[PDB]
Each structure stands twice: as C-alpha cells, then as structure tokens.
Subunit: 160 residues, 8 copies
C-alpha cells in the first residue's frame, strides 16, 4: 500500500535512532517509506523529495538528523505537510546541537520537534499516528487501543 508517512534521515548512523519510528508505524499498520536524505551532500535530492511529497500522497514527514541538523527544517521549507523532527544524539554535545538546530525554527516555517534520541523517534511516529487518526477512523481505534494498553500495562511498584 502507498506510503502516507515518509521517514528520512541524514545518515546510516541515524538509523539506530530512526528505526524506532519505523517499528512503531509498522506496529500501527501505517504504510510508510524510509530513506536517507542528506541535507548538505544531496541538497537537490532534499528539495525534490520535500516539494513532491504531497503530490506523492505523503501526509506527514518524520526527519531525523544530528549535529548541525538542517534536514527537518529545510524539508519544511519545501513542503506544506507537517514535518516532525527527531534530534539524533551527537557524540560531543549529546544532541544539544541537534536539538537547538531543529527546534529553534524562526516564525513562519514549523518543525514539530520530539525528544533527543530513541524516545523522540518513537514519539514522532506516535505523533504522526495521532495526526492521521484525525481522519482515519480505523487507525484512530487502533491508536486508542494502543494508548489504553500502555496505561493498563504500568506496574504498581518497582522490583525491589
């Protein structure tokens, strides 16, 4: 089935983080595509990917990158689709450079930013699902079930 979410990332090394977004979309049965798009090495590829995303049937883009992380913001510059950004943890600055380079978008072009690292990747997929659930009743029911199960599955006390 045709992808409705695009997961894009700046490097193979980003996959260790972005795979959590991929896994969650699959769990919720959301058709998606997963690609490498390098903002600084393939900027024309980025422009083409972002500007054709809507006509290709994508509804949400999840973009992950680290360091001077320009991929999510430049994607949002070229699409009117919602773009969600995942700061990938960097070696020296522990993803603080990733976080600030993604979340601090000047007014006019948004990127909905999630936590540094694997939690952020999981949550980008969940946020994408909650967006799609607004106009996809079957997915909305699956998501409600997922959230309810998460709540019900919490233990009462730690293993001491």
């Amino acid at each position: 089935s045709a992808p409705v979410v695009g997961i894009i990332m700046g490097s193979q090394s980003d996959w260790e983080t972005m795979r959590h977004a991929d896994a969650l979309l699959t769990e919720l049965e959301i058709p998606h595509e997963t690609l490498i798009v390098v903002a600084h090495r393939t900027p024309d590829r980025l422009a083409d990917y972002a500007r054709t995303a809507a006509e290709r049937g994508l509804n949400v883009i999840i973009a992950g990158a680290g360091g001077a992380a320009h991929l999510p913001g430049m994607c949002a510059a070229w699409t009117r689709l919602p773009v969600l950004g995942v700061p990938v943890e960097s070696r020296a600055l522990k993803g603080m450079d990733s976080l600030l380079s993604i979340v601090q978008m000047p007014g006019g072009v948004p990127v909905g930013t999630l936590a540094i690292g694997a939690s952020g990747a999981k949550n980008a997929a969940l946020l994408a699902a909650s967006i799609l659930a607004l106009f996809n009743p079957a997915l909305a029911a699956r998501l409600e079930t997922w959230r309810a199960l998460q709540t019900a599955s919490v233990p009462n006390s730690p293993i001491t």
Copy 2:
C-alpha cells in the same frame, strides 16, 4: 463555528507569547478557543479539558508554558489528539528550562515542540494548520496562499 484548535496557556503573562498563535489561527480562519489552563494551579481543570477535548470536537491542542513547563505534557497524557508545545521564555533561564521540560517527553506520549517564544507560538499555529489542511481542502488552499505570500514578500536586499 465550533473550535477545532484549543490554545491553552499557564498564565496571563503567557498571553504576550501565545497571542501570536491566536492571531495566526484567526488569519487562516481556523475556529479556535483561547483559554488559561494551569498545570500546577488548576490540575483538575487540565485533566477535564484534555480528556474531553476530542469529544468536544477539538482536533489539535496548542499549549504554552514557561519554567518547569508541564502543561503540554500532562495535556498529552489525557488526550489522543496531537498536542503542540510552546516553550514560553522564562525570566532567568530564557526558556531553556521551558524547552527541556516540554521537548524531552518519554517515549509513549508525544508533544510536538516549537521554538522558544513568539516564533514558537506562531509556528504551533502554522503546524496545527498544516495538520488540519490534510483533510480540509479549503484551508489547505488558504495555507498554500499564506506560505506563498510569506515566500514572495521577502525583499531582495536590506533597507540600509
């Protein structure tokens, strides 16, 4: 008509920031409500607001707060709707506390976070618009126009 976005904020002082979200939704003719909901001072108000949001017809919640900013995250805890978080600039730490307390959500409950301050409030409204545009064609066209005008209106050189 009935609101489809809720803008909520933790204090009157936050309005100086969140008014930019309100103005943008109004510009795009997106029906919305603008309220004060305080995580720490009105926690039952918050629970009720978030848990009933979907049944009231809300599709997106935009939540702004500063300092130890818990309003967006606790809102997300009680709703399946997408929650967008605006870190309000705090006096001492300039919204770095706001930013980290909003963006660093554990996996399982997302908050799509925007920039510290007025830019973030404006972008939360634009991100909400891009979400709604996925299933509202008239709005999608108005958002296209908005983004086109933003792009086209940029001068070629500074006034010196």
Copy 3:
C-alpha cells in the same frame, strides 16, 4: 506500621536511583511505601495518589523522575503535603533536563529539589526525616545520632 512517607518514581529504571531513599528511610526506622507512578502513562493514578495521600496518613512524598520530569510537580499540584523531588540522571543531558523540569516550579506550588542522582535520593530521605523529626522525638534523637556519627566518621587524611 502505616506509611508516613511515600516514595514514588516514574519507571523501574528509576529504582536504581530511588532505592537509596528507600534504604535510608529503613535505616532511620521510618515506615514508608514505594510505588511506580507514571505521570504521562497513568495520570489519573497520579491524581488519585496525590490527592488521597494526606487522608491516608502520608506526611511527605519523595518523587523521582528523569527527562521531562513532571511527576514531582504534578504530585505537588494535588497535595498540600511537602513534596521532595529527585532528578534522575538521563542519558543524553545527564539529568539537566530532569533538574530544570523539577526545580523550576512557578511560584505557588513548591517542590523541594535535591541533587541529580543517588545523592539526591539519599538526601530526599534525610530531608524527609528532618521534617518528621520536628514532631517525632524518638526519630529526632535517631537523626541527631546519625548526623553526629557521620561527622565523627570522617577521616583526617586521604589514603595516599
């Protein structure tokens, strides 16, 4: 004997830190309970725990969490008991996100915050003990003995 301190934490992974609070309360013979309460996954459980704490006979709540650490602050929103917060060390940001999301409570709802990590957990228990000692003479004597022994046990010079 009935608990007079509640130790609550956001995850099993928090136990590695919060166990130091548990150990210290036991050492000083302070009856307590130890539970997992997840702010974002079980927000109604949190509300019920906090709002019934006083009537259940609890006098102090020690709450530990990491990342976007909302558990201590939201607990304090629902109880008039003193709430002590322990920032649990996070992977990327080394507990700085934990610290700011706990200590920077806006005026009106306090959380008495301790150091990041195991030291903070130990000190939360000690601070709880010093609070209870104000109206429990036997505990006050045990605590005085404990502090005096700590002082007397310091070596004069390092092992060189």
Copy 4:
C-alpha cells in the same frame, strides 16, 4: 510570638528576592525572623545562627544567596532542621551558578532547593508552611484555604 521560621540572605540586594518569602509567611501568619547572614563575610555569624536555631525554637530555615551560593549548604551543615535553599538570580549567569551551587549537595546533608528567583522565595515559604502544617492544625487549615484560593482565582481566559 517567637519565630518558627528563619529567613536568611547573603546581602541587601538579595532582599528584592527574599521579600517574597517574607510576604508569604506573613500572609499565612507564620511567626518568622528575617536576617542577613553572609557565608563568606560573616562565617562565624552563620555557624552560630545555624547551630543554635533549633534551641531557639526555629523549625525551618529558608536561605537565599546568589553566585557561588554557599549559605544554604553551610547552614544545613550546622543544623538538624530542614534547610530550604533559594537560588538568587545572579547578574551574569542568571542564577545558574546559584542553582548548581545550592542543589548539588553531596549525600548526607540535604538542602531542599526551590526555583531561581522570586518564584523560589515564594515557594520556599509555602514549602515551609506545608512542613509546619503537618503538626499545626490551624495553620494547615489556613494553607488549605490559601491553595484553594490560588486554584479558584485562575481566570478561564486571558485578557486580550
């Protein structure tokens, strides 16, 4: 009547911040004393103040200081009473130095730390009140009223 909370601060300049603690204790009719005690300039005054606090009838000490802020921690070193620390906003580093030098106490000697600035001073007083309320029923009722009024007085919408 005899003071049961001591508010101490490192300079006249700190009074701009610590006056918020003083005002809150007065509002709740908690007898207190408000003094200047300087860790670095009057260290013997500090030692004497802290070591005699309990025998003078003090139950809680609230201590505020900025920069390399040692006043709360050294106070805690000489008393078994709970010590609450208020990081005062410093000129250059905006109280981040104040915050880390107060909150990061080694295990064995706690300081319950509140937010940087006026919010922290107000919350230190409220935290002191919640501690005293555990064994003072009339005060507990006044604190209940205070918190109820704070909750109830929050408007539903901002003034625009």
Copy 5:
C-alpha cells in the same frame, strides 16, 4: 565593479549585525553585494544564489542567520566557494542556538564560523579579505595597513 564577495542574511533584523561586514568590505574597497536570502522562506532563491555564485564571479560568501540557523550550511551545500558563517544573536538563547547550528557542520561540507554577533560579522569580512589577499596584491597591502593601524591605534592606558 563586479562583486567578489556576497553578504547574505536571513532577515532585515539581521542587518543590524551584518552591516558590520558590509562596512568593513567597503573600507577595504572590496566589491560586494548585500542581499536577503532566507533558508526557510526562500529556499529556491537560496539554491539559485549559491549554485550560480561562482559563475557570477563571487569568490567568498558571508552568510548570517539566527536561531536554527541553516543559511550558511545550505549555501555551502550548493557551492564550492568558501562560505563563512555569522551566528546572529537570538533573543532567548543569545546566539548559542545560532552558533551550534552553524559551526557543527558534518565532515564534507565546511562553514568557517565566526563569533556571535557584530564581532563575527566584522571578522567574516576580514577573513574574506585575508582569503582574497592571497591572490590580489593591492588588497593584500591595504589589509596589511588595516591590521597595522588596528595594532598601532591601541592606547597604552584606559581613560579613567
């Protein structure tokens, strides 16, 4: 004569900073152009500007932006010319976001980064001059004079 340095910036507000680069190039009689090019609002303008810079006779590009500052890096992505980046001071984070989003470029696409603010803009122009001086002897002599005057003009004592 035809410009050999391009000064580009993300907004009219950035001109307050980038005017210092413009003034320095003018002082050294280096032909240049001064333009607004916005990474997020005019991304096609940016691509065209950078990709044609060399064929238009530009030798160095100086790019200034604030916040999630992507302009220098994306410029460097589309040109083989040296790109110098000026972090503009942002309101909340004082250009720390600007700095990290510019300097932390992944290996393969450089941006030579200067200090936050006016100093960085002036130094980007001086660095551009030092680059051009390598193959322009008249300019090299004017730059020698400029640096000599800067050194010689320093007073021996402050005015008190």
Copy 6:
C-alpha cells in the same frame, strides 16, 4: 614541493583529531607541513611560526587545540593569512571550552572555526582547499570532482 598549508596543534594528543586534516590535504594533493606548536609552553615558537608563515610561502594555517584553546587565535594575531581553527574535544566539557575559546574572537582578528572534533579537522582541510582553489585551477577541478563524487555516493535508503 613547498608547503602551502600549515597544520599546527597543541599536543600529540591533538593528532588523533588533526590527522583527518592531514589526510584530506594529501588526498587533494595539497603540499603541507604538520607541526606541534604549544601556545602556553612555546609562545615564542608560536610567534615566530605565525609571523614568518606568509614569507615562507604558506597560504592558510589550520590550527587545532582543546580546553583553553588559544593557539588558533594567537596565530591569527601574528599573521595576515587566513587561520582556520579546529576545536579539539576535551574530556570534561566535551570541547565546549575548546569551541568558545576559538570561535568567540573579538572583532578585528578572525579565526574561521569548524566543528568540534574529527569533522572539524576534515572540514578545515576542505575549507583550506576551497580557498586555494580560487587561484589554483587544477586544484579547483580536483575539488569539484571530490564534491561531486561525495554527492553521487550517497545511498538512497538505510540498511534496515
């Protein structure tokens, strides 16, 4: 052949980082020299190296250091050549001290600064190459080929 780029560093421990600059210059067939120059232990050596660099035929200096990293800035004080600075990652502060001590040059004496660590060293060499390419056609062709190959070599999707 005579060196046209000087790579200098503050310690043998810096070589682990600076070797990436050396490797890249060699790959692009740029003659260079590689030396240790310690700002604080051999300050006269530094002065002599920098002030004679131009007459010795050097065109660019790449300087790497960590901690209180003064080598690049003091080199630039004594030469009119472009100086590029590489912040070497430090143990405690992860190169943040290195970065700020290099990039924050006051106006009047520039250092073109690259990313913390190995990426910065690689990019300093690439930036040096792009500078030399402005007046060396054979190198300009080699660099264009290098950048084109880098772009062409990017995979389309991650190894999943």
Copy 7:
C-alpha cells in the same frame, strides 16, 4: 613608588570592570600600574610586557578580558609571576566564553581565575593583596583591617 602589581585589560570597554581592581589596590595602598594590553591586537606588546614584568619589579599580574579571552593565559606563558585572570562579561554569552577560555588552562601554565565581572576584578585585587601580604607585614595588617571591616559592617537585617 614602583608598581608591584600590573592590571592589564583588553580594551577601554573592559575598564568598566577592571576599575574595581584598580580601586581596591588603591584602597590598600598597593603601588600598581593600569594598562591596556590586547592579546590579539598587540601581541608583541603582550609578550614584552609579560616577559619583562619580573625584572621591572612586578610581583603579580591581574589580567581581564572577554569573549575568547586569551590575555591572562598568554601573559602566564611569558612570565614566572602569578597571573590572576578576570573574565569580563561578554554581550551574548554573559562571560561564559570568557570564563572557560581563561580557567581551563592546560597543566603546566596556571592562571588563578576569579568570578565573571566586577566581583572578579575586586577579588583579583584582594587575592593579589593576600599574596603580597605573605612577605609585607604592613600590608598584611591593612588587609586584616580590610577583611575585619568587611565582616563587621554587614547589617543584621535587611532594610525593608
């Protein structure tokens, strides 16, 4: 009489800060000289100043600078005298750049660093006085008096 402390600073703007060192030395009747010496603009002046300081009869150098602050460290590189460093508050980063670039000296060449700003300038002068007092009995007595007056003059309560 002949100066025994040198106060040096990187600009006229630094005088707003370093005047506090000058005032303190004057108060204690310590002969001193107050000069502008710029690490980056007058590096030969710096070398000459530091290398001849001891033979000129100087015993301590107090050096203040902001930003990438290299003046104290390079001074220490050329003298065996104790060098005390004052981080001047910078516009964007509030002297955090100043602080790290001064305090993080590699082993082998020390700079005794004081607080950011006016407090640091005053304390550098006091630290210089405490050094000189070790072998100057009249000064030691005046310093005793100074510290005694500082301690004694602290009021017991704030003016409200």
Copy 8:
C-alpha cells in the same frame, strides 16, 4: 620541615585529582600537608583549619572539591591567606557544578580557581609555587628551571 602549603579535599575520591598537586609540590621541594576536610560533614574542623592556618605557618591553601563545592570558598572566608580552588570533576555535570560553585565567589572573598580536574590540581601547585617564589630565591630558581625545561621539552612535530 614545617608545611607552608596545605592541600585539603572533600573526600577520598578527590585524591585521584588532588594527588597531582601533592606530586608537584614534592617535585619542587615545597613542604606541605595533605588532609581531608569536609565542608558539610565537618564544618567546625574546616573553620578551625582555616582560621589557624596562618599562625601554623601555612602560606597558601589549595582546596579541591566537587559538586556543590563549598570547601574552597568557606576556607577563604576564615583565612587571609591566598586560597586556590580545584574543581573536581563530578559524574553527571562533568565538573561544571564544581567550577561554578568555586569560581563565582561574590566580591570581597577571593578563590583563585584552576581548571576542572587533574590539570587544575597540577596548576594549583604551580601557582602556589609561583607565589612562594616571590620571597624564596632558591625556590624561584627551581621554578625558573622547571618552566624552562617544560618549554625546551616540547617536540617539533607529532608522531604521525
């Protein structure tokens, strides 16, 4: 021979860092003592140590501690001797809490602060030596020899 420098530290775990100060003093034949003094556990021991240091013949105190590092500052409060502070690296915050709690002394009571960790400990000993060398000619000659050897021992190029 009677000690003229006191090395004090807050814990046995600090010895791993402070041993570098001890080693350097011994190398330069400076008689010294090495002790554990815990600011928060043995505050009276601290007061007695500091206030009797001068009469005991100490000339310089080197104090190391981590976290909320109050030992150097409280030592300086009780002595007129120069106090040098070594920030010991902490687990979570990498010695940034140590650094700020030591260097940011308010005006009136100085601590000459060295780098975080082993470099700072070595440099505290060297700074102490340079202070003592002002009135001890034999030590001054040993120190000059030491600095000259350090300069002469620097290699010309890295091992490649």
